[PDB]
From a paper:
Pyruvate kinase is the last-step enzyme in glycolysis that catalyzes the conversion of phosphoenolpyruvate to pyruvate while phosphorylation of ADP to produce ATP1. PKM1 is constitutively stable and active as a tetrameric form, whereas PKM2 is allosterically controllable and can exist as a tetramer, dimer, or monomer in response to various effectors.
The crystal structures of H391Y·Ser·FBP (R = 14.4%, Rfree = 21.7%) and R399E·Ser·FBP (R = 18.0%, Rfree = 21.8%) were determined through the molecular replacement method. The model consists of four subunits, and each monomer of H391Y and R399E displayed an overall homologous fold similar to that of the wild-type; each monomer (531 amino acids) comprised N region (1‒43), A domain (44‒116 and 219‒389), B domain (117‒218) and C domain (390‒531). The active site is situated at A domain in close proximity to B domain, and the FBP-binding (431‒437, 482, 489, 513‒522) and Ser-binding (43‒46, 70, 106, 464‒471) sites were situated in the C domain. However, substitution by E399 essentially forfeits these contacts because of an anionic carboxyl moiety, even in the presence of FBP, and thus a conformer that lost allosteric regulation. R399E shows a diminished salt-bridge network near the C–C interface. As such, R399E exhibits an FBP-resistant allosteric activation as seen in the coupling-function analysis. H391Y and R399E exhibited a reduced level of FBP activation profile and decreased values of Qax (3.56 and 4.10). Each of PKM2s was immunoprecipitated using anti-HA antibodies, followed by Western blotting analysis.
Residue numbers in the entry:
A (entry chain D), C (entry chain A): 14 to 531
B (entry chain B): 14 to 125, 129 to 531
């Protein structure tokens, strides 16, 4: 009568839905990664500590805004808050840092005069668009400037142009070279520097601009753990980002953001080149008809799970929590269905960057992820992941799937794995056990990147190596036991699964033990 | 393209069938146990060595016939043939000895070693005057069941000689029944008699049975096949007689009548395994219903995780000819597909002209059939029907089998003192052979009852360091597998072990390359 | 608690097996066809009448033996027996006649002396096989003649040779021209004119010999319904057979007998070209290792089920009943499992052609089939057959599959179908309903050939055509009900499914009705 174990026993999906209970409380452990965007509301040290206690795993910096120096000062504070807890290495939480590139964004110019100044637009009214730099800080209700110099080559008559994140639409009546005349189809106020999207068009900007180059190089300087590459359209876009990171950034992980039609059409070659995927729903839902977005979301998450690569669901998950302390019912549903669909991580944007309730937002996500994890139908999920996954002779693969079937058989409080690269923990997570995966590593980077995988609770063993390998192994296992008790995941005399290798070095995980908690 | 691995991939049973292929060769290992009835044809030491090499696992002695001195000698020969292979521990094969009780049979009398001949429509009086107990003929017939006249009615049907001859009852009384013959045939001496519609109140454990089970205990048999078990208390009666001294002897109940079928669930619970006794069962219930009973029992046994044995007329034509009929081919293969742990030969090995050919042919067929099982479905069914547990050992067993499928392992190697750890694995029915390494030679002989368990008996003395004693026995298993052709250097096997000595602590699963 | 209805309710195959109950009695209807081979024991009119009441649906004539005059008299008798029941059109049962060809057999010659003579062959003995026609009637223990002139070309030292249904095995020790020297391996006594098999060998005998041609012409003259073509090795073999049947016998059904390695290897092209398949296990279990036959059986059955074509299981199903009035447990089990495998028809050979208990064997097949039909796991079968079925716009297909599902939901007593060609009845049977399919037709050939499909109970309407079509339809629907009532398939108030088209002529079946029985 807990963890939805009654519904876990159903022999159909529908009987499984029918058995779900609001009075079956979940376990302590939460498997889904939380990712928070840091900005004015959340960049203070004091508050960042509170985000970490609340459940933040990764901190994301949007490089569509702000300066290398401002960002460097966010990071510094994230690292200070994080290390504030190394005091007790048993309760320490590694906290990753991710870099979100500008990429091929299209923006409007400044509104003439005051900073905040917006101009009201009205349906049917007229708007001329120019590329004349005279006008770039002189935008208003008749004339508007755009930073995409080649716009006219690619937008025809009939075309639609959305501005301010889908909320203002315009139609292309007449067009020269230099300028476009438009009729306003949906009005509203327009401020300075707003996102422009061109649904019909083949936008021809480079995947990595010189601005992107400098930003990527800065992130290599700063030892960030991952990069969220914007607007990826094809594999070669991914490789180009991989080259700009080069040898020095070779361990930093690349998440292609999919946020347009081409990204979606060529998803297979992009996923093959990337380390993970983000479903970038804001842009994506302007670049395609908003009603189609749920399908791309489910296509991308499914294929990532089929391929054992992390997928993040993003944007407007709890929008209303920017202004209010509780979410709407669609927001509640949406976070929960992201987890149920299969998402490894879930992202907060404005809600933590600039909102009036960043901590509450983090908590709500933590609370909902945990309910929805219990609600997942593991029976079917696990069987469908066994079937699709190929056959191999890799003993770690066999050991990984054995540990998972065993975790179901005995309702183990956790599956513990020792791992240098993380790779042995990733092989377990791909099969989606209910129980949490406590990944014990010495490598601080592996610990931080581990958060991209559903279920991995990384822990960082700071202790020196023993002279006897067998003793060193057992000390790490036992470290995972102490973390699990201290966290409430399990208590003494509960059974856990433990994974280890037949010899030192990566790639040898082959041993699975069913072990009582000491 | 080997082991029907193509068929094993399919999404449906029907596509699985379509992908079955006569040119996909089976692995060398054979998982289904073979039991052979020993008799005039096969009781010599010379013939028994060859039966073992051809794949016999359990020697059955039928106590419906023979004297204790006779069976004691049979055993002595089996133990001799078996021990002749201890020369090389790596190739030694444990052989079990099983005792199969007479039970409450009914038999005819002697004849006036000659045979009279009943014709359809003819008249036959049946009698209980013991003066006639050694002169039966076309007219008069003696049976040794004294209450026969109390339980029969006007019209009831009597089958004689394993169902070949049949009589109907035209008039009753006491001492006499008058019967019309319905199926003619050549009656002989002391033949089986069956009274389908009737409830026979003979003891389950008769005076003779009691002395025969004692023989079992003294002779040190491994298991007992108790005939005509009708209800759970019959099995308790048997367990009692075996008593304290006989308590590690497994009791396999033989279902051969309508009541045993009906009270199957309770008999299963009390028994350590089941034998589907198709000979008698197929006269006591209509022959067309046997396959239903058989599949019901194999099914409930696989569900309970207890061994079940298919028996009787599996290769009947091979008593006289050296190839079986096509039916006989089919039937053996379907018993394995149904889920039988063991298959059995009777007359084929006891008294036929081709005992070794019959054993070989069970070995070949079982090996083909085990590769044609749709494990995808079978494993998911057994895994699901399994109640969740706290036992680390169940978890470890299921983890092992899951891993044996993901990497198509050459075997699952298990150390076990009592057998129990190997049994847990075999309940889930891996494709891969389970090589169970033990020092207890009784554990090794009984382990044949379970599908896929190839017991190996370790004769090495105990190393003083426990980890080294564990490795040695793992390596021994490896050498057995290499030598028998189950696998070779660099293949993967699963290895299952515990974290300390003593029963009940198996908790460790390793995926290991063969050295 | 009848028809194994408790077992039909189970969620898994394994639970389905567990609930099979020997006290859950079957319905009256038997769905699997029974094909009896005719010969001395069964060819009297008196005996044939009773074969028919006992359940023979098809009369099989084995052309490997006997003259045209003798077979003509057999057919005459088949039809006298059959037509003896036409007095009562309600109880009248179409009985088909099938011709089984000789084909490329290899046969020995005559034993010297007595026509009835045998010789002993003893393990270790030398036996010489000659082609010199001198010896064709002087065969004995030292010298054996056979009728395949090219045998020496196709065998080598080491080869095996089986004689008389695999009883006797020889091993070639030397290969001359015009002879072989062999060692007897399995001895046994040998009589005259016995079949020879060469497992190793690329036998080259012609698909359709001069004698097969005489024979097929004769079948066309006698208006047989189906041909069983022996030793089909490839599609062109089937074509060759079709030519000889030509126009006069274009609608005569060709069932390819698979009895050798090449047939099995090329099964798909043979299947496509044929109207049906027989698994001829006698020859097959000598041409391939005996332990592999059950594989071939199940491959062929599954593939014919998948394609919707009749498949017959044949040979030694009840062999002991040639001498004993009750079958062995393996035989009882073999038959059940052929039905459970998915076979449309099961066949009897010596059991009915020369044995002592022809009626009893026919009755046993009836009884076992009826039990085994109930024990089928229809939930899974029907789900998979629907699943595998290619998708079609064909209204008749959609109607068939709706009728089958409807028959399941209301546990109907029959599926009544009107059909000219048989086709619409076949499309129901391919989906494998529990309920018997009663096919009403005015076409006597259609009736006789429907016996090759599991479930079809053909009924032959002799009444003339009503002027008003709608009444002509009702009249045949109503003749089906009378047949069902009289046979005890159902009774007044039971529901049945009735299938019709929207106009006369073949191909228009599109109407399913759920109908209480008056
Ligand atoms: O996940 P990875 O990178 O393969 O790391 C797993 C490795 O960790 C170990 O358990 C311990 O190795 P170290 O002692 O070198 O950390 C190995 O046995 C195993 O092969
Ligand atoms: O299957 P069983 O009878 O419980 O025996 C399994 C036992 O065998 C072992 O692997 C070896 O024990 P021993 O050293 O006592 O033979 C134990 O670790 C384990 O508990
Ligand atoms: O199976 P077939 O040969 O298509 O026969 C089915 C045909 O039988 C009918 O039900 C009626 O046939 P009739 O021409 O005999 O009236 C048609 O509606 C239907 O098209
Ligand atoms: K960005
Ligand atoms: K007995
Ligand atoms: K023939
Ligand atoms: Mg974007
Ligand atoms: Mg018996
Ligand atoms: Mg043939």
């Amino acid at each position: 009568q807990t963890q939805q174990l009654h519904a876990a026993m159903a022999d159909t999906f529908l009987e499984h839905m029918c058995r779900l209970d609001i009075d079956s409380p979940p376990i302590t452990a939460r498997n889904t990664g939380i990712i928070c965007t840091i900005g004015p509301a959340s960049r203070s040290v004091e508050t960042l500590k509170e985000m970490i206690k609340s459940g933040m795993n990764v901190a994301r910096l949007n490089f569509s805004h702000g300066t290398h120096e401002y960002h460097a000062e966010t990071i510094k504070n994230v690292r200070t808050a994080t290390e504030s807890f190394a005091s007790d290495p048993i309760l320490y939480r590694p906290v990753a840092v991710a870099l979100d590139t500008k990429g091929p964004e299209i923006r409007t110019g400044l509104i003439k005069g005051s900073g905040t100044a917006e101009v009201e637009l009205k349906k049917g009214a007229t708007l001329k668009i120019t590329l004349d730099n005279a006008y770039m800080e002189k935008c208003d209700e008749n004339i508007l400037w755009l930073d995409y110099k080649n716009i006219c080559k690619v937008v025809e008559v009939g075309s639609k142009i959305y501005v301010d994140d889908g909320l203002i639409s315009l139609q292309v009546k007449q067009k020269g070279a230099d300028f476009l005349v438009t009729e306003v189809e949906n009005g509203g106020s327009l401020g300075s520097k707003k996102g422009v999207n061109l649904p019909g068009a083949a936008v021809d900007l480079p995947a990595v601009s010189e601005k992107d180059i400098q930003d990527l190089k800065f992130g290599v300087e700063q030892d960030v753990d991952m990069v969220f590459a914007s607007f990826i359209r094809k594999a070669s876009d991914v490789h180009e980002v991989r080259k700009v990171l080069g040898e020095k950034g070779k361990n930093i992980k690349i998440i292609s953001k999919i946020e347009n039609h081409e990204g979606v059409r060529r998803f297979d070659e992009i996923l093959e080149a990337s380390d993970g995927i983000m479903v970038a729903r804001g842009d994506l839902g302007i670049e395609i008809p908003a009603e189609k977005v749920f399908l791309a979301q489910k296509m991308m998450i499914g294929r990532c799970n089929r391929a054992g690569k992390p997928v993040i669901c993003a944007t407007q998950m709890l929008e209303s929590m920017i202004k209010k302390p509780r979410p709407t019912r669609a927001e509640g549903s949406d976070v929960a269905n992201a987890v149920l669909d299969g998402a490894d991580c879930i992202m907060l944007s404005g809600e933590t960057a600039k909102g009036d309730y960043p901590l509450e937002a983090v908590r709500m996500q933590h609370l909902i992820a945990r309910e929805a994890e219990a609600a997942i139908y593991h029976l079917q999920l696990f069987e469908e992941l066994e079937r699709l996954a190929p056959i191999t002779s890799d003993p770690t693969e066999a050991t990984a799937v054995g540990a998972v079937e065993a975790s179901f058989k005995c309702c183990s409080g956790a599956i513990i794995v020792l791992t240098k690269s993380g790779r042995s923990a990733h092989q377990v997570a791909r099969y989606r056990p209910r129980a949490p995966i406590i990944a014990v590593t010495r490598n601080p980077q592996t610990a931080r990147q581990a958060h991209l995988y559903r279920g991995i609770f990384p822990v960082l063993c700071k202790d020196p190596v023993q002279e006897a390998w067998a003793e060193d192994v057992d000390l790490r296992v036992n470290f995972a036991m102490n973390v699990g008790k201290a966290r409430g995941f399990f208590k003494k005399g509960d059974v856990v699964i433990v994974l280890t290798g037949w010899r030192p070095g990566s790639g040898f995980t082959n041993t699975m033990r069913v072990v009582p908690v000491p």
